[PDB]
Amino acid sequence: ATAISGTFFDKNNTSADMTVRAYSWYNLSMGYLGWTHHSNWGFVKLKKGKPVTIALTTEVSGLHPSITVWYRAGAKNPKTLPYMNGHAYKQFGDIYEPNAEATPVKVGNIIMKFITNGFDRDGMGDALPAEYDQSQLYRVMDGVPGKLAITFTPPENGWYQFVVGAINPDIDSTAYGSGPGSGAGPATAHTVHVEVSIP
Ligand SMILES: [Ca+2]
Ligand SMILES: [Cu+]
Numbered sequence: 001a002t003a004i005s006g007t008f009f010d011k012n013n014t015s016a017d018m019t020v021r022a023y024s025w026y027n028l029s030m031g032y033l034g035w036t037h038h039s040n041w042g043f044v045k046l047k048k049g050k051p052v053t054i055a056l057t058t059e060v061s062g063l064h065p066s067i068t069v070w071y072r073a074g075a076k077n078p079k080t081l082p083y084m085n086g087h088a089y090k091q092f093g094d095i096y097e098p099n100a101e102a103t104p105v106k107v108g109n110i111i112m113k114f115i116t117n118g119f120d121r122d123g124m125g126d127a128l129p130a131e132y133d134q135s136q137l138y139r140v141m142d143g144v145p146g147k148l149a150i151t152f153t154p155p156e157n158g159w160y161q162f163v164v165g166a167i168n169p170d171i172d173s174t175a176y177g178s179g180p181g182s183g184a185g186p187a188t189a190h191t192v193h194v195e196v197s198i199p
Helices: none
Strands: 006-009 015-020 040-046 052-057 065-072 095-102 105-120 147-152 158-166 190-197
Touching (some): 006 015, 015 158, 052 158, 065 147, 105 147
Antiparallel strands (some): 052 147, 052 190, 065 105, 065 158, 095 105
16 A cells, blocks of 8 residues: 545535646556546545535646545544555556555555546547547536536445546646656646535
8 A cells, every 4th residue: 555645524624725637547658547646635524325526626728627436445543544555546446455554554454445436528629539438437528628526425424535636638738738748747736626515
């Protein structure tokens, strides 16, 4: 496992500004993975059965925010929350790292059950490049570039661990910058505003 910086949310702290790289959720290398540390992580404790919405917005021209939500099952001490199983992540699918260790600390079993994901597909044009042709990378349109909402109903009480990033910045836009490079794009950190609607 590897430590991450988490932003925690609750009923009195429903919003945050997170900073992410333009390609952070979908690098153009390898297996087209997100970069754990180029993205930004949130945590929120939720009650079973009541729908939740997370809304992302950005002012950055060309930027398309994105998000993956997992349920962090069996989490015990909250100080064991801000870890990930590695420096890269698949945008969908479940994560399992039994008896996980990081920097040494013992984190316990990391069990992350996939809940939902989405990315802002408004403004990307008539067709995305073929590198993005994975069905479970949920393309969502609300008619507003730079805005995204996801929803889910917590299947279990407890901690929901989510990553915010961005994907496929518009060619030659501010967000695109110098382009994908080696796959991670520019190191520029762009602000995405996050609002969690806790029931
Ligand atoms: Ca949108
Ligand atoms: Cu990393």
